[PDB]
Amino acid sequence: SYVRPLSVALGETASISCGRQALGSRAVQWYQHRPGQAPILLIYNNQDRPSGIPERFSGTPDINFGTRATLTISGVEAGDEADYYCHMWDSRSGFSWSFGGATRLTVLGQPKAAPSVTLFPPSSEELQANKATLVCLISDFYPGAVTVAWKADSSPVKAGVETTTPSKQSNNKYAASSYLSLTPMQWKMHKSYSCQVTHEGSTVEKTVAPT
Amino acid sequence: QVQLQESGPGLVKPSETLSLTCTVSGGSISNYYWSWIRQSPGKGLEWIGYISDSESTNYNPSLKSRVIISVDTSKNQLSLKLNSVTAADSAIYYCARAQQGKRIYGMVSFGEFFYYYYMDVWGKGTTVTVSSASTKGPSVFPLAPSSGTAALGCLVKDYFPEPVTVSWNSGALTSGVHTFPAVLQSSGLYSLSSVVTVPSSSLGTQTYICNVNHKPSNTKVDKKVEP
Amino acid sequence: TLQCTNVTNRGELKNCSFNMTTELRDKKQKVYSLFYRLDVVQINKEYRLINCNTSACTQACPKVSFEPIPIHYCAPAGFAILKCKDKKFNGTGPCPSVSTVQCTHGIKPVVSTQLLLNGSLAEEEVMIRSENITNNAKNILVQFNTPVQINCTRPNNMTRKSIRIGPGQAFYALGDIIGDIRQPHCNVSKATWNETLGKVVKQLRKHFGNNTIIRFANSSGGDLEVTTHSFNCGGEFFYCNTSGLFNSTWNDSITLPCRIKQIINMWQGQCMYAPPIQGVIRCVSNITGLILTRDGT
Amino acid sequence: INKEYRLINCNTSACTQACPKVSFEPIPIHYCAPAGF
Ligand SMILES: *[C@@H]1O[C@H](CO)[C@@H](O[C@@H]2O[C@H](CO)[C@@H](O[C@@H]3O[C@H](CO[C@H]4O[C@H](CO[C@H]5O[C@H](CO)[C@@H](O)[C@H](O)[C@@H]5O[C@H]5O[C@H](CO)[C@@H](O)[C@H](O)[C@@H]5O)[C@@H](O)[C@H](O[C@H]5O[C@H](CO)[C@@H](O)[C@H](O)[C@@H]5O)[C@@H]4O)[C@@H](O)[C@H](O[C@H]4O[C@H](CO)[C@@H](O)[C@H](O)[C@@H]4O[C@H]4O[C@H](CO)[C@@H](O)[C@H](O)[C@@H]4O[C@H]4O[C@H](CO)[C@@H](O)[C@H](O)[C@@H]4O)[C@@H]3O)[C@H](O)[C@H]2NC(C)=O)[C@H](O)[C@H]1NC(C)=O
Ligand SMILES: *[C@@H]1O[C@H](CO)[C@@H](O[C@@H]2O[C@H](CO)[C@@H](O[C@@H]3O[C@H](CO[C@H]4O[C@H](CO)[C@@H](O)[C@H](O)[C@@H]4O)[C@@H](O)[C@H](O[C@H]4O[C@H](CO)[C@@H](O)[C@H](O)[C@@H]4O)[C@@H]3O)[C@H](O)[C@H]2NC(C)=O)[C@H](O)[C@H]1NC(C)=O
Ligand SMILES: *[C@@H]1O[C@H](CO)[C@@H](O[C@@H]2O[C@H](CO)[C@@H](O[C@@H]3O[C@H](CO)[C@@H](O)[C@H](O[C@H]4O[C@H](CO)[C@@H](O)[C@H](O)[C@@H]4O)[C@@H]3O)[C@H](O)[C@H]2NC(C)=O)[C@H](O)[C@H]1NC(C)=O
Ligand SMILES: *[C@@H]1O[C@H](CO)[C@@H](O[C@@H]2O[C@H](CO)[C@@H](O[C@@H]3O[C@H](CO[C@H]4O[C@H](CO)[C@@H](O)[C@H](O)[C@@H]4O)[C@@H](O)[C@H](O)[C@@H]3O)[C@H](O)[C@H]2NC(C)=O)[C@H](O)[C@H]1NC(C)=O
Ligand SMILES: *[C@@H]1O[C@H](CO)[C@@H](O[C@@H]2O[C@H](CO)[C@@H](O)[C@H](O)[C@H]2NC(C)=O)[C@H](O)[C@H]1NC(C)=O
Ligand SMILES: *[C@@H]1O[C@H](CO)[C@@H](O[C@@H]2O[C@H](CO)[C@@H](O)[C@H](O)[C@H]2NC(C)=O)[C@H](O)[C@H]1NC(C)=O
Ligand SMILES: *[C@@H]1O[C@H](CO)[C@@H](O[C@@H]2O[C@H](CO)[C@@H](O)[C@H](O)[C@H]2NC(C)=O)[C@H](O)[C@H]1NC(C)=O
Ligand SMILES: *[C@@H]1O[C@H](CO)[C@@H](O[C@@H]2O[C@H](CO)[C@@H](O)[C@H](O)[C@H]2NC(C)=O)[C@H](O)[C@H]1NC(C)=O
Ligand SMILES: *[C@@H]1O[C@H](CO)[C@@H](O[C@@H]2O[C@H](CO)[C@@H](O)[C@H](O)[C@H]2NC(C)=O)[C@H](O)[C@H]1NC(C)=O
Ligand SMILES: *[C@@H]1O[C@H](CO)[C@@H](O[C@@H]2O[C@H](CO)[C@@H](O)[C@H](O)[C@H]2NC(C)=O)[C@H](O)[C@H]1NC(C)=O
Ligand SMILES: *[C@@H]1O[C@H](CO)[C@@H](O)[C@H](O)[C@H]1NC(C)=O
Ligand SMILES: *[C@@H]1O[C@H](CO)[C@@H](O)[C@H](O)[C@H]1NC(C)=O
Ligand SMILES: *[C@@H]1O[C@H](CO)[C@@H](O)[C@H](O)[C@H]1NC(C)=O
Ligand SMILES: *[C@@H]1O[C@H](CO)[C@@H](O)[C@H](O)[C@H]1NC(C)=O
Q: Do A36 and B92 touch (CB under 8 A)?
A: yes
Q: Is B4 exposed, middle or buried (0-12, 13-18, 19+ CB in 10 A)?
A: buried
| Spatial distance between the Cα atoms of C280 and B163, rounded to a whole number of angstroms | 59
CA distances in angstroms from B153 to A153, A187, B224, C197, listed in the order given = 25, 20, 9, 90
Q: How far apart are CA B149 and CA B140, in angstroms?
A: 24
CA distance C91 to C94: 10
C-alpha D2, offset from chain centre: 31
* Whether B99 contacts B2, CB under 8 Å: no
3-state secondary structure of A74: strand
| A1–B153 CB contact, under 8 Å | no
DSSP, collapsed to helix, strand or coil, labels residue B190 as strand
| SS3 call for B200 | helix
Task: Indicate the domain borders of chain A.
Answer: 4-108, 116-208
Ligand 5 nearest-atom number relative to CA C14: 27
Superfamily designation of domain B3-130: Immunoglobulins (2.60.40.10)
Closest listed residue to residue C17, CA positions, set C40, C154, A23:
C40
Phi, psi of C259 (to 5 degrees): -100, 180
User: How many CA atoms, within 13 angstroms, populate the side-chain half-sphere of residue A45?
Assistant: 11
B108 CB neighbours in chain C (<8 A) are none
**CB distance from B107 to chain C under 8 Å?**
yes
Residue ranges per structural domain of chain B: 3-130, 139-224
Q: Which long-range contacts (C-beta less than 8 Å, at least 24 apart) are formed by B107-113? A: B107/C182, B107/C183, B107/C185, B107/C255, B109/C255, B110/C182, B110/C183, B110/C185, B110/C257, B111/C10, B112/A91, B112/C180, B112/C182, B112/C183
Q: Which residues pair with A28 in a beta bridge?
A: A88
C168, D14 contact by CB (below 8 A): yes
Tell me the C-alpha distance between C58 and C291, whole Å. Answer: 30
Nearest to C224 by CA among C245, C244, C243, C238: C238
Q: How far is the CA of C236 from the centre of ligand 4 (A)?
A: 14
Residue count of chain A, please give it: 211
CA dist list (Å): C5 to A95, C32, C47:
20, 11, 10
The 10 Å Cβ neighbour count of residue B132 is 7
CATH number, span B139-224: 2.60.40.10
Q: Does any CB of chain C come closer than 8 Å to the CB of residue A24?
A: yes
Secondary structure letter of residue D33 according to DSSP: P
Beta carbons within 8 Å of D26's beta carbon, 6+ residues apart = none
Strands B190-199 and B183-184: antiparallel
Distance B104 CA to ligand 1 centre (A): 6
B3-130 shares its CATH topology with B139-224: yes
Q: C180 to chain B: which residues are within 8 Å by CB?
A: 105-106, 112
| DSSP string for C159-185 | EEEEEE-SSS-EEEEEEEEES-----E
Of A26, A99, A135, the CB nearest to B143: A135
How many Cβ atoms sit within 10 Å of the Cβ of residue A206? 17
Rounded to the nearest angstrom, the gap between the alpha carbon of residue C195 and the centroid of all alpha carbons in its chain is: 24
Resolution expressed in Å: 2.4
Name the residue in chain C with its Cα closest to that of D12.
C168
Rounded to the nearest angstrom, the minimum Cα separation between A66 and chain C is 8
Interface of C with A (CB under 8 A): 8-9, 157, 178-181
The CATH fold of domain A116-208? Immunoglobulin-like (2.60.40)
Taking the domain A4-108, which CATH number applies?
2.60.40.10
Interchain CB contact of B92 with A (< 8 Å): yes
Cis peptide before B161 (omega within 30 of 0): yes
Name the DSSP letter for residue A37.
S
Q: What is the DSSP annotation of C126-162?
A: -EE--SSTT-TTS-EEEEEEEEEEEEEEEEEEEEEEE
- Which of A61, A64, A62, A71 lies closest to A19 in space, CA to CA? A71
Q: Give the residue before each break in chain B, using a C-to-N cut-off of over 2.5 angstroms; say none if it is continuous.
A: 147
Q: How far apart are the first and last CA of chain B?
A: 47
Contacts of A67 in chain C (CB under 8 A): none
Which residues have a C–N gap over 2.5 Å right after them in chain C?
Answer: 9, 44, 250, 268, 296
CA angle B3, B5, B11 (to 5 degrees): 165
Q: Is the peptide bond before A143 cis (omega within 30 degrees of 0)?
A: yes
Alpha carbon of C93 to ligand 7 centroid (Å): 6
| Bridge partners (DSSP) listed for residue C17 | C3, C32
**Residue C125 amino acid letter:** E
CB B141 within 8 A of CB B155: yes
Q: Return the residue in A3, A53, A135, A167 with the most chain B beta carbons within 10 A, the one to mutate for interface testing.
A: A135
Distance in angstroms (rounded) separating the CA atoms of residues A98 and A28: 13
User: Residue A63: which residues within 8 A CB-CB, separation 6 or more?
Assistant: none
Determine B/D contact with 3+ CB pairs under 8 A as the test.
no
Sign of the torsion angle spanned by Cα atoms C95, C98, C102, C105: negative
